[PDB]
Design a protein around this ligand. Sequence first.
Ligand SMILES: CC(C)[C@H](C(=O)O)N(CCNC(=O)c1ccccc1)S(=O)(=O)c1ccc(-c2ccccc2)cc1
Ligand SMILES: [Ca+2]
Ligand SMILES: [Ca+2]
Ligand SMILES: [Ca+2]
Ligand SMILES: [Zn+2]
Ligand SMILES: [Zn+2]
Length: 159
Amino acid sequence: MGPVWRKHYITYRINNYTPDMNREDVDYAIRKAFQVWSNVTPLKFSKINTGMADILVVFARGAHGDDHAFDGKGGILAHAFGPGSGIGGDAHFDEDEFWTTHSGGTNLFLTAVHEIGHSLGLGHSSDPKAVMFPTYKYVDINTFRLSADDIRGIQSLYG
Ligand SMILES: CC(C)[C@H](C(=O)O)N(CCNC(=O)c1ccccc1)S(=O)(=O)c1ccc(-c2ccccc2)cc1
Ligand SMILES: [Ca+2]
Ligand SMILES: [Ca+2]
Ligand SMILES: [Ca+2]
Ligand SMILES: [Zn+2]
Ligand SMILES: [Zn+2]
């Protein structure tokens, strides 16, 4: 399991914004990614604009303060630490990627769904249709859904 969030009201803060996208588009993509997980669990997420939140969302290139430097364009897209104090929960996105709302570049929403999975304590699935499969995919977002494996994985932690 890992430890899990021992409370069901979890705060997040967007630390900074990628210049690849409009700020409002970043806000929407992240809020909707959290919503994917709250739709199948009792978890509730709340965005805050001041102070430290449980989950800090950061855009950064190369070394960014946590022993896990990003690698430039391509390769690693993002990473997130599992539930825990401090850096635990935080989700970091590689600014050397080109973040988009569509099929071009790297889709922020889909990547955020995957990283938030890790922020909540999920590892990787072996189901190729699962969002927690370790390989990037792009699917039409308005028909994107969590796979059976994703749903029961997250419910095994937060049911
Ligand atoms: C660094 C790691 C935390 C990260 C991730 O899983 O989020 N990546 C995976 C790195 N490779 C592996 O962990 C691995 C594990 C077993 C065998 C081989 C390699 S990723 O950045 O390539 C990455 C990959 C995919 C997605 C993703 C998946 C589905 C939809 C959108 C994005 C996001 C980041
Ligand atoms: Ca990269
Ligand atoms: Ca944290
Ligand atoms: Ca970028
Ligand atoms: Zn990091
Ligand atoms: Zn992953």
